Design an enzyme around this catalytic site. Structure first.
Site, PDB file in Angstrom:
ATOM      1  N   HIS A  63       8.382 -10.958  19.983  1.00  0.00           N
ATOM      2  CA  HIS A  63       9.405 -11.546  19.109  1.00  0.00           C
ATOM      3  C   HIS A  63      10.528 -12.227  19.872  1.00  0.00           C
ATOM      4  O   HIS A  63      11.145 -13.128  19.337  1.00  0.00           O
ATOM      5  CB  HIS A  63       9.965 -10.567  18.057  1.00  0.00           C
ATOM      6  N   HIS A  93      18.619 -10.214  25.240  1.00  0.00           N
ATOM      7  CA  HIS A  93      17.617 -11.130  24.732  1.00  0.00           C
ATOM      8  C   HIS A  93      18.337 -12.226  23.967  1.00  0.00           C
ATOM      9  O   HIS A  93      19.547 -12.165  23.758  1.00  0.00           O
ATOM     10  CB  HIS A  93      16.640 -10.393  23.813  1.00  0.00           C
ATOM     11  N   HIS A 118      22.213 -11.767  22.840  1.00  0.00           N
ATOM     12  CA  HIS A 118      22.595 -10.406  22.494  1.00  0.00           C
ATOM     13  C   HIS A 118      22.478  -9.498  23.694  1.00  0.00           C
ATOM     14  O   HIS A 118      21.380  -9.281  24.203  1.00  0.00           O
ATOM     15  CB  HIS A 118      21.698  -9.869  21.374  1.00  0.00           C
TER      16      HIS A 118
HETATM   17  N1  LIG Z   1      18.879  -8.313  17.665  1.00  0.00           N
HETATM   18  S1  LIG Z   1      19.695  -6.964  17.947  1.00  0.00           S
HETATM   19  O1  LIG Z   1      20.401  -6.558  16.762  1.00  0.00           O
HETATM   20  O2  LIG Z   1      20.446  -7.094  19.165  1.00  0.00           O
HETATM   21  C1  LIG Z   1      18.486  -5.740  18.247  1.00  0.00           C
HETATM   22  N2  LIG Z   1      17.571  -5.336  17.416  1.00  0.00           N
HETATM   23  C2  LIG Z   1      16.751  -4.374  17.898  1.00  0.00           C
HETATM   24  C3  LIG Z   1      15.676  -3.726  17.313  1.00  0.00           C
HETATM   25  C4  LIG Z   1      14.944  -2.774  17.948  1.00  0.00           C
HETATM   26  C5  LIG Z   1      15.270  -2.408  19.249  1.00  0.00           C
HETATM   27  C6  LIG Z   1      16.330  -3.020  19.894  1.00  0.00           C
HETATM   28  C7  LIG Z   1      17.092  -3.988  19.286  1.00  0.00           C
HETATM   29  S2  LIG Z   1      18.455  -4.913  19.783  1.00  0.00           S
HETATM   30 ZN   LIG Z   2      19.121  -9.813  18.914  1.00  0.00          ZN
END
Ligand SMILES: NS(=O)(=O)c1nc2ccccc2s1
Ligand SMILES: [Zn+2]
Ligand SMILES: NS(=O)(=O)c1nc2ccccc2s1
Length: 259
Positions: A63, A93, A118
């Site tokens: 993803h 990421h 992020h």
């Molecule tokens: N896109 S985020 O909110 O930074 C994020 N979502 C997720 C979901 C699963 C594991 C780590 C992260 S970090």
């Molecule tokens: Zn993110």
């Protein structure tokens, strides 16, 4: 098993069927209405302490790609701002678009940026990441918008390794990367309580979104868009538009660190 994505049949509008918290009260991302966000003089300056960061590996997880850090002790940490205590950097990421006019998750007065970085951190008071995500103050995610203009020199090492992790499940060594090279000049920010933006969508995040975007070149972001969602040898699905749209703000206030 997990079969959510960003395709034509498993995208964000479907996620609620397996992750009902998708329709919850503190979902992310959100639109930041700059005129409604209130300056909060009680907020502190952020403390981004990345001098001792230890990057380890970069992974295409199907993803996005994650640059992973050694979070076995306090090295790279985020403190201050709206936060109590110490949050350890675990990975960063990005989310990005098929073209420059979309890609960010948060929006600013409905403006979408080309991408959003992020930097994900977990609250060390809970001992491990898996415990932290079960708590309303378990994570802090530092969000940074990307616009297309001049190249970001500190991003180039990331984009040059992407050819080696084209498909889902591929990883590569990625040591000695300095994430300070991805920050803008100013640490002015907005903050609000929210969630992870991919499944499991847990409502465990204090969001800190920087006001100042970083500039990356068209060539840099074009290389993000050559990644694949698919695994090796499978039909090619370009990794683009891996962003969740803005969710309802509900009973939440977005606070500004700056006047
Ligand atoms: N896109 S985020 O909110 O930074 C994020 N979502 C997720 C979901 C699963 C594991 C780590 C992260 S970090
Ligand atoms: Zn993110
Ligand atoms: N997790 S989800 O977005 O609700 C999801 N969508 C789809 C579509 C087709 C097959 C399996 C799944 S699982």
């Amino acid at each position: 098993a997990h079969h959510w994505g960003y395709g034509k049949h498993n995208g964000p509008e479907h996620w609620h069927k397996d992750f009902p918290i998708a329709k919850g009260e503190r979902q992310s991302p959100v639109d930041i209405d700059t005129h409604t966000a209130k300056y909060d003089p009680s907020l502190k300056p952020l403390s981004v302490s990345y001098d001792q960061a230890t990057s380890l590996r970069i992974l295409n997880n199907g993803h996005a790609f994650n640059v992973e850090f050694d979070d076995s002790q306090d090295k790279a940490v985020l403190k201050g701002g709206p936060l109590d205590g110490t949050y350890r950097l675990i990975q960063f990421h990005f989310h990005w678009g098929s073209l420059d006019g979309q890609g960010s998750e948060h929006t600013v007065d409905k403006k979408k940026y080309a991408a959003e970085l992020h930097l994900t951190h977990w609250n060390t008071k809970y001992g491990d990441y898996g415990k932290a995500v079960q708590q309303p103050d378990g994570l802090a995610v530092l969000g940074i918008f990307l616009k297309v203009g001049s190249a970001k020199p500190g991003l180039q090492k990331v984009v040059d390794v992407l050819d080696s992790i084209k498909t889902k499940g591929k990883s590569a060594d990625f040591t000695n990367f300095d994430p300070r090279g991805l920050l803008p000049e100013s640490l002015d920010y907005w903050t609000y309580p929210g969630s992870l933006t991919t499944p499991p969508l847990l409502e465990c995040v204090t969001w800190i979104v920087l006001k100042e975007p970083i500039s990356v070149s068209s060539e840099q972001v074009l290389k993000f868009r050559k990644l694949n969602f698919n695994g090796e040898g499978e039909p090619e699905e370009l990794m683009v538009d891996n962003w969740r749209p803005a969710q309802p703000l509900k009973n939440r206030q977005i606070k500004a660190s700056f006047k």
